[PDB]
Amino acid sequence: CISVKGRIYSILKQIGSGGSSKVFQVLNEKKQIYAIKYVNLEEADNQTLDSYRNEIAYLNKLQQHSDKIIRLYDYEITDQYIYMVMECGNIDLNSWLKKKKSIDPWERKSYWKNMLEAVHTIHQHGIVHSDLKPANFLIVDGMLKLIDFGIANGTVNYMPPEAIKDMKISPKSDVWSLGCILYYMTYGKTPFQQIINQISKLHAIIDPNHEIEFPDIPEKDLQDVLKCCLKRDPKQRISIPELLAHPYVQIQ
Ligand SMILES: COc1cc(S(C)(=O)=O)ccc1Nc1nc2ccc(-c3ccc(NC(=O)[C@H](C)c4ccc(F)cc4)cc3)cn2n1
Ligand SMILES: [Cl-]
Fold this sequence. Notes:
Layout: E1 2-3, E2 8-17, E3 21-27, E4 33-40, H1 46-61, E5 72-77, E6 81-86, E7 91-92, H2 93-99, H3 105-123, E8 137-140, E9 143-146, H4 161-164, H5 172-187, H6 198-206, H7 220-229, H8 240-243, H9 247-250
Antiparallel strand pairs: 1-2, 2-3, 3-4, 4-6, 5-6, 7-8, 8-9
Bound molecules: the ligand COc1cc(S(C)(=O)=O)ccc1Nc1nc2ccc(-c3ccc(NC(=O)[C@H](C)c4ccc(F)cc4)cc3)cn2n1 and chloride ion.
């Protein structure tokens, strides 16, 4: 059992395991299920501490706004630890993408509508996630949900081109990454999943004369979204507001 704000939660099991953190499935007093995230601050430098405070502040704040942000029922913070008590998932996306070989199309689209609402609402509060990946979303009553904001602190397929020339972050960056996910969700893999040598996989992402391949398919709209989501020049890439009005999410 765990105590947050003098409330007892019988642990049912581990679900998540970071270096300094855990996620637990958990029964409350009335034996309703919840996920609780534990973070251990014992070893946490001052920025890492501010990053946590910020992510939490912003996750706290976007409760009102969107059911597509992971619900957060309560939290405690202390110099030693953090507990966050949250609605409990079925499974993350990275998980659910690996097993599924064949995806119903009215359900891929429902999930895409869900990703757009979520990322739309963080863009409206000046949050660019800057590292979107399926890990960052969670299925919850068949509804897809964002669980973090890329503020707090090993795949590389979802990385947008402009990211690689950091070496300035516009919400377009997120659109690329949502792209990369949607691509996997229709062509069973990410765009640069074939190019295993990483030094060159980076070179492919930035190269305009390199051509991402979009197999012709039944939903032409969906083919259009992916091409528009994966334009290298971010000012030519399609905005979240644009994507929300695209036939693909609009035509029934
Ligand atoms: C059976 O349940 C399952 C099973 C399987 S599995 C093993 O089948 O793949 C998989 C999943 C579930 N459920 C589940 N439910 C929930 C609810 C909430 C979250 C959740 C919410 C927010 C965060 N936030 C953060 O990690 C960020 C980085 C953060 C936030 C605050 C900080 F101070 C520091 C960092 C992270 C996780 C995760 N899960 N996961
Ligand atoms: Cl509660």
